[PDB]
Amino acid sequence: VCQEITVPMCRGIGYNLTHMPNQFNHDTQDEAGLEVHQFWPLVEIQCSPDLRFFLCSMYTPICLPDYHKPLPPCRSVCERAKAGCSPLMRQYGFAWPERMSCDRLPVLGRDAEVLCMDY
């Protein structure tokens, strides 16, 4: 079933409801939220206007009551966030996370049946 998002940084990004487990197999929003919290300095610095939405689209993925297919962000969302933010991360010794590699995400409109989220 769908639950109201309780991860504070992921409220106000365009949708209200999520469902667990997410694609990292976090079992609760609490677990997901403790991890995504670590990205707050990157979000504050605004290296990319897509980052916040992108992070939330994976940590608290959108839930629709009638839809049971997973709705990842589109690859393009990831690409923009990565292009904006990875240089700054690299500058702090952080590589772009392995679990966030964009090639794992569907391309917008490539497959009619495979929907995804574009900001």
Ligand X SMILES: CCCCCC/C=C/CCCCCCCC(=O)O
Ligand Y SMILES: *[C@@H]1O[C@H](CO[C@@H]2O[C@@H](C)[C@@H](O)[C@@H](O)[C@@H]2O)[C@@H](O[C@@H]2O[C@@H](C)[C@@H](O)[C@@H](O)[C@@H]2O)[C@H](O[C@@H]2O[C@@H](C)[C@@H](O)[C@@H](O)[C@@H]2O)[C@H]1NC(C)=O
Q: Which residues bind a second copy (CB under 8 A)?
A: 8-9, 11-12, 37, 40, 43-47, 49, 52, 84, 87-88, 91
Q: What is the DSSP string of 64-85?
A: BTTB-S--PBPHHHHHHHHHHH
From 16-24, 37-45, 53-61, 66-74, give the range in contact with ligand X by CB under 6 A. 37-45
CA angle 84, 53, 55 (to 5 degrees): 80
Report the 10 Å Cβ neighbour count for 3: 14
Residues in contact with ligand X, shown as a per-residue x/- string from 79 to 108 under the rule CB under 6 A: ---------xx--x-x--------------
Question: Cβ of residue 31: shortest distance to ligand Y, in angstroms?
Answer: 19
Greatest distance between any 2 Cα atoms in the chain: 43
Q: Minimum CB separation from ligand X for residue 109, in Å?
A: 31
Owner of token pair 């991860």: 7
Q: Which residue is nearest to ligand Y (CB)?
A: 16
Binding footprint of ligand X, residue count (CB under 6 A):
9
